[PDB]
Amino acid sequence: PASTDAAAQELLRDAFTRLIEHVDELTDGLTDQLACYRPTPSANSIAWLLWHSARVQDIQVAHVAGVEEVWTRDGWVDRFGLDLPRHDTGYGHRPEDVAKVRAPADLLSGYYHAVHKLTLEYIAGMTADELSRVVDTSWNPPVTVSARLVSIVDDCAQHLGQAAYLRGIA
Amino acid sequence: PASTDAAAQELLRDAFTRLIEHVDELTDGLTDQLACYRPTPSANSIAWLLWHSARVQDIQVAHVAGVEEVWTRDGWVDRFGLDLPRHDTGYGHRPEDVAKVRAPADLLSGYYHAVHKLTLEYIAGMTADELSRVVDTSWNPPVTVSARLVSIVDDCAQHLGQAAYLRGIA
Numbered sequence: 354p355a356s357t358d359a360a361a362q363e364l365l366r367d368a369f370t371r372l373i374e375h376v377d378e379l380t381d382g383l384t385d386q387l388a389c390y391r392p393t394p395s396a397n398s399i400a401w402l403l404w405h406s407a408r409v410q411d412i413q414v415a416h417v418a419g420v421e422e423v424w425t426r427d428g429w430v431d432r433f434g435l436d437l438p439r440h441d442t443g444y445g446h447r448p449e450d451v452a453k454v455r456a457p458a459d460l461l462s463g464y465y466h467a468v469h470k471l472t473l474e475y476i477a478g479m480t481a482d483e484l485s486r487v488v489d490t491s492w493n494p495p496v497t498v499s500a501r502l503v504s505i506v507d508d509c510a511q512h513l514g515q516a517a518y519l520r521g522i523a
Numbered sequence: 524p525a526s527t528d529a530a531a532q533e534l535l536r537d538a539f540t541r542l543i544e545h546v547d548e549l550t551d552g553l554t555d556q557l558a559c560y561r562p563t564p565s566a567n568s569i570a571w572l573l574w575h576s577a578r579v580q581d582i583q584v585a586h587v588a589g590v591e592e593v594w595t596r597d598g599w600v601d602r603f604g605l606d607l608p609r610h611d612t613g614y615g616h617r618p619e620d621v622a623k624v625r626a627p628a629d630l631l632s633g634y635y636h637a638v639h640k641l642t643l644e645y646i647a648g649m650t651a652d653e654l655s656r657v658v659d660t661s662w663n664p665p666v667t668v669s670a671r672l673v674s675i676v677d678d679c680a681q682h683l684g685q686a687a688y689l690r691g692i693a
């Protein structure tokens with residue numbers, strides 16, 4: 354570690370903080386009826402997008418950080434009590450599975466806030482060496498930590514943006 | 524500038540490159556009918572989201588970089604020929620203005636690619652000092668270059684994510 358790591362630490366902290374800010378916006382005043390709206394029968398809903406975004410960030414950050422997902426570490430999976438396998442992230446969900454993801458806004462927000470805390474703790478000490486470390490050799494180009502973190506922000510930003518679009522028409 | 528600037532340069536290059544990759548995906552096989560779909564009468568369309576995202580990135584990057592927007596520099600505004608004021612970005616658009624933003628997919632992609640080139644040229648030499656420079660004193664907290672760049676990526680990622688959602692239901 355070196356003092357010049359602070360710039361990339363700040364870029365990462367700011368990017369991840371925008372995601373949690375969107376979660377606060379999306380969940381404020383979010384009712385169950387709005388959270389479950391689907392504009393067409395196969396389309397993703399707000400609740401699914403909020404939950405999937407949090408799950409994806411949890412599993413992917415926990416992998417690069419080498420820690421347990423908060424979903425199981427703190428029993429969030431049991432507080433949600435969804436009719437789904439315990440490890441599900443939504444990556445494998447069919448259109449019908451979307452309707453199973455139903456939870457109060459406070460639980461969607463609380464789980465994402467716990468994932469955000471986990472993420473802040475990992476990125477806070479990020480070094481140049483860690484950013485260039487490869488975490489996935491199965492893809493070409495092999496995935497560095499830097500690329501994986503950018504992938505997480507982008508995927509979650511897209512899903513949270515979709516949820517905001519739906520919140521305006523639901 | 525210093526060699527330790529490379530880490531933040533790479534984070535920025537990768538984040539902005541994901542946006543242009545989404546543009547390539549969204550515009551491939553995009554017809555005029557799909558580009559203009561609105562799921563409800565007031566909702567934003569794919570063409571508007573692609574154009575607005577490019578305009579926002581152009582004006583905001585050009586401001587921090589101290590250069591001219593590519594929209595006017597290379598006459599993109601005239602190639603589009605939209606029935607709108609020449610400086611419009613979409614920030615001021617009413618629901619009815621959305622229907623005026625209609626352009627072939629190749630022009631939407633070409634303009635975003637020119638904005639992406641402008642962005643790559645700016646972020647390529649990013650230094651720690653530049654990242655902490657304030658570009659907007661009117662907000663509290665005052666906006667640093669680092670925060671502004673994160674804001675641009677996030678806003679554009681959200682709009683491009685919304686366009687991808689619409690492409691799947693249009």
Ligand SMILES: [Cl-]
Pocket residue numbers: 440441442443444445446
């Ligand atoms: Cl799954």
Ligand SMILES: [Cl-]
Pocket residue numbers: 610611612613614615616
């Ligand atoms: Cl405008």
